[PDB]
Amino acid sequence: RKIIHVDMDAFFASIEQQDNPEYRGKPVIVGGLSGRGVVSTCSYEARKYGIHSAMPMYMAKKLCPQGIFLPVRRKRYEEVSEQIFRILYDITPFVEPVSIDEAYLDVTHVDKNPEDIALEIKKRVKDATGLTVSVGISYNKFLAKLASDWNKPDGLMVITEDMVPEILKPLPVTKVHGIGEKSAEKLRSIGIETVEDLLKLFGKTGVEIYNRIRGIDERPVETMREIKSIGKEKTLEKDTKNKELLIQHLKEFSEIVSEELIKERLYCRTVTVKIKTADFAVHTKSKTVDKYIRFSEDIYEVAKGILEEWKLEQYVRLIGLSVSNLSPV
Numbered sequence: 001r002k003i004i005h006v007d008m009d010a011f012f013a014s015i016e017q018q019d020n021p022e023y024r025g026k027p028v029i030v031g032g033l034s035g036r037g038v039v040s041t042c043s044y045e046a047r048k049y050g051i052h053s054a055m056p057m058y059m060a061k062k063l064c065p066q067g068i069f070l071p072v073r074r075k076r077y078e079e080v081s082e083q084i085f086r087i088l089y090d091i092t093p094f095v096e097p098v099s100i101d102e103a104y105l106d107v108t109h110v111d112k113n114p115e116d117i118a119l120e121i122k123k124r125v126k127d128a129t130g131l132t133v134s135v136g137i138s139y140n141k142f143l144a145k146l147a148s149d150w151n152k153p154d155g156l157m158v159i160t161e162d163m164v165p166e167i168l169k170p171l172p173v174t175k176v177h178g179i180g181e182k183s184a185e186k187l188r189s190i191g192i193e194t195v196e197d198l199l200k201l202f203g204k205t206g207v208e209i210y211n212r213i214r215g216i217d218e219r220p221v222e223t224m225r226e227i228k229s230i231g232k233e234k235t236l237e238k239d240t241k242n243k244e245l246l247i248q249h250l251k252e253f254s255e256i257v258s259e260e261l262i263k264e265r266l267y268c269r270t271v272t273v274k275i276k277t278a279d280f281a282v283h284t285k286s287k288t289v290d291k292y293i294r295f296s297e298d299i300y301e302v303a304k305g306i307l308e309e310w311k312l313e314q315y316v317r318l319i320g321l322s323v324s325n326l327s328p329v
C-alpha cells in the first residue's frame with residue numbers, strides 16, 4: 001500500500017500572509033477576536049512566541065503584543081481549500097478528506113513514485129495558491145500522517161517499514177497523533193511519556209494504539225465517507241420539566257453542532273430534538289427549514305422553537321439535539 005498524507009502549513013495564517021504582503025514574515029494569529037476568542041491557527045513566526053491553536057486569544061496577545069491578530073475569514077479559506085482539493089483529486093480519485101486542510105491519498109495504483117507525487121502536490125499547490133504543504137509518505141494512514149506532521153513546515157518525509165517502531169521511540173506521546181489529548185496525563189501520570197516507554201509495554205481502544213505504534217494500521221483510505229447525522233446529548237443530574245434549563249442545554253448543543261458542521265464543510269436543513277422521559281421512553285421531534293443553516297444561533301433557534309411547542313407530558317432526564325439532511329460533498 002502507498003499512502004500519502006497532505007497537510008497545509010498554518011492554513012488560515014498562510015492564506016492571510018499570502019493575500020497580504022505586508023503580513024509576510026511576521027507573526028500572524030487567526031482566531032476569535034471577541035471575549036472568549038480562541039486561536040484558530042498561527043504562523044510559524046507566531047509559534048516561536050509560544051502561541052498555538054486552541055489557546056485563548058488574550059493570552060496569545062500577551063505572548064506576542066506586536067503580533068497581527070485576524071478574524072476567521074471562513075469563506076476565503078474555503079475557496080482556497082477547494083482549489084487545493086481539486087489538485088488532490090486530479091492526482092488520483094482515491095482521496096479521503098480529513099478537514100479543510102487535510103487529506104489522505106491512496107496512490108498504491110498510481111504510476112509515478114510517491115516521492116515524485118508529493119513533489120507534484122507541493123509544486124501544483126504553491127503554483128496555484130502561493131502556499132506550502134507538508135506531505136507524508138508511508139504504507140499506512142497513521143504513519144503517513146506522522147510523516148506529514150514531522151518536518152512540519154514545508155516538509156516531506158517517507159516512513160518505510162525497516163523503520164518500524166525504531167524511529168518512533170523518541171516521539172513524545174503528546175505527539176502520539178493516533179489518539180492523544182485524552183491521555184495527555186493518565187500516561188504522564190502513570191510515568192510513561194515516550195512511545196519508547198509505551199512501545200509494546202484504559203480506553204479499551206488500546207488494540208488500536210498498541211497496534212498503531214507498530215507498523216500496523218490497515219484502515220483504508222475511505223473515499224465516499226457520508227455523514228448522515230451530527231448531534232449531542234446529555235443525561236441530566238435530576239428529572240425536570242423546566243423548558244428553560246432544557247433550552248440552555250440546547251444552546252450549548254447548538255454551539256457544538258455548529259462547530260462540527262463548519263469543520264465538516266457542511267450545512268443542514270433538519271433539526272431534531274430528543275428527550276428521554278422518566279418511564280425510559282425516547283421522544284424525538286424534528287423540523288425542516290427551506291434554507292441551509294450552519295450557524296450556532298440558527299440551529300438553536302429551530303431547536304428552541306421545537307422545544308417550546310412540545311408540551312412535555314412526563315419528566316425529562318436526557319436532552320439531545322441533532323442535525324441531519326445535510327448539504328453535499
Ligand SMILES: [Mg+2]
Pocket residue numbers: 007008009010011101
Ligand atoms: Mg494544517
